[PDB]
């Protein structure tokens, strides 16, 4: 059964001064909780560790980055005056002694720090039906999803056939793409790939469904613009088989 | 006072062949140190750790050797696996401080069997006002570059696996909504096979 590290939340959109509260639970056993930011261009930076309610050992950041540990050895960091560098995956690891023994990292808080909350968009997704030439020369059907004009990245593309979660025949791209390279505040796209045989797309009780999360805004966080508010959703994308 | 270094920065490489990571660091002052990997948009898995009084460690096809005085240690992978492409860290830890190095990113290519080059026009979406082109079948010594024009998007190869048919293929994902597109030309600043198939009319 057992509960690996536990990171809560898994995402955040702040705009510029805000303050955040980052939760993480050890492996149960595991007293020693450290905190790292990771960032593209300074990669893993060590904030602190904590170990029986008190900081062991803190790293270089400014005094608006802090921790603590309650005494069932769990640990929150908080980070105030928000800046745009702050985003980041700030990733949790536990271990029994960190002198000697290996850490075991949580998946992170994926945070996003923006100038205006009218910079984030969902992604609009679409399914690609299989080329009929490719099935005549192949005998297999590759369908495409794109996930395009999201910003920020903070998405997760899966497909289903039939109702089931697959990974057999699936390829999505390891990072999105900007749609304008050169701006900080870019929407991206992704492409993902699913390929099946002909026979099983000349099926037409074939259900194939690409899913996309979007972690995006708060009930609390203000909304004035026109368009809907982007907020927390799945957006899909659907197809069934026919003879082709 | 502490740097750590790794090289290579990014590594690719054909699957069944062996590979050498190395770290170093100027500190010679550890209490250990930690190779981990990561795969994209996850957390770090430890793999070895090495106190500061062992010279090596082994798990499965992961060797890793450490020479604290040199400032060194070199991760060896044997008969590498598509499966092993992640970033691969190293860390140490220092006295009162934790420091790791900027990664080395490991791809390990399929062999691929039987290429089939092809260029592919796929169905027109009637939720969509994209139009889309698949570039697949190709061998993993294909290299695919970006379009010459901004408004056209497209997606390095990315290798999938049909486990069931003990089949594997390579492919690159092109689109764009502008009307002077077409999946003739959609590649045209890659090269590609002169043999790769483009379809009448998956292509133009």
């Known amino acids: 059964m057992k509960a690996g590290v536990t990171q809560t939340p898994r995402y955040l959109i702040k705009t510029r001064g805000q303050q955040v509260t980052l939760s993480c639970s050890p492996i149960?056993?595991?007293?020693?909780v450290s905190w790292y930011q990771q960032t593209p261009g300074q990669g893993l930076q060590f904030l602190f560790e904590?170990?029986?309610?008190?900081?062991?050992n803190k790293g270089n950041f400014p005094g608006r980055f802090s921790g603590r540990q309650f005494s069932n050895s769990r640990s929150e960091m908080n980070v105030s005056t928000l800046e745009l560098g702050d985003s980041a995956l700030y990733l949790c690891?536990?271990?029994?002694?960190?002198?000697?023994?290996?850490?075991?990292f949580g998946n992170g808080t994926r945070l996003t720090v923006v100038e205006d909350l009218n910079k984030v968009f969902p992604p609009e997704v679409a399914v690609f039906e299989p080329s009929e030439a490719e099935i005549s020369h192949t005998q297999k059907a590759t369908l495409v999803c794109l996930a395009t004009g999201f910003f920020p990245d903070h998405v997760e593309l899966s497909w289903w056939v039939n109702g089931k979660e697959v990974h057999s025949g699936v390829c999505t791209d390891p990072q999105p793409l900007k749609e304008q390279p050169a701006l900080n505040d870019s929407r991206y796209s992704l492409s993902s790939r699913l390929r099946v045989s002909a026979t099983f797309w000349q099926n037409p009780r074939n259900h194939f469904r690409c899913q996309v999360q979007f972690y995006g805004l708060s009930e609390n966080d203000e909304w004035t613009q026109d368009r809907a508010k982007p907020v927390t959703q799945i957006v899909s994308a659907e197809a069934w088989g026919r003879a082709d | 006072k502490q740097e750590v270094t790794q090289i290579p920065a990014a590594l690719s490489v054909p699957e069944g062949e062996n590979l050498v990571l190395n770290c170093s660091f100027t500190?010679?002052?550890?209490?250990?140190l930690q190779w981990f990997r990561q795969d994209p948009g996850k957390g770090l898995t430890s793999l070895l750790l090495?106190?500061?009084?062992?010279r090596e460690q082994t798990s499965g096809r992961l060797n890793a050797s450490l020479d604290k005085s040199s400032g060194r240690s070199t991760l060896y992978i044997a008969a590498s696996q598509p499966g092993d492409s992640a970033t691969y860290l190293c860390?140490?830890?220092?006295?009162?401080?934790?420091?790791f190095g900027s990664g080395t990113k490991l791809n390990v290519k399929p062999n691929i069997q039987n290429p089939d080059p092809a260029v592919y026009q796929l169905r027109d979406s009637k939720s969509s006002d994209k139009s889309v082109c698949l570039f697949t079948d190709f061998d993993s010594q294909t290299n695919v570059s970006q379009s010459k024009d901004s408004d056209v998007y497209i997606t390095d190869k990315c290798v999938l696996d049909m486990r069931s048919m003990d089949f594997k293929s390579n492919s690159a994902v092109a689109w764009s909504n502008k009307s002077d597109f077409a999946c003739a030309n959609a590649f045209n600043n890659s090269i590609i096979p002169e043999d790769t198939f483009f379809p009448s009319p998956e292509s133009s």
């Open positions: 690891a536990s271990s029994f002694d960190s002198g000697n023994s290996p850490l075991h």
């Open positions: 149960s056993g595991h007293r020693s």
């Open positions: 090495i106190q500061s009084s062992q």
């Open positions: 904590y170990f029986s309610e008190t900081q062991r």
């Open positions: 500190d010679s002052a550890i209490y250990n």
């Open positions: 860390a140490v830890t220092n006295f009162n401080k934790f420091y």
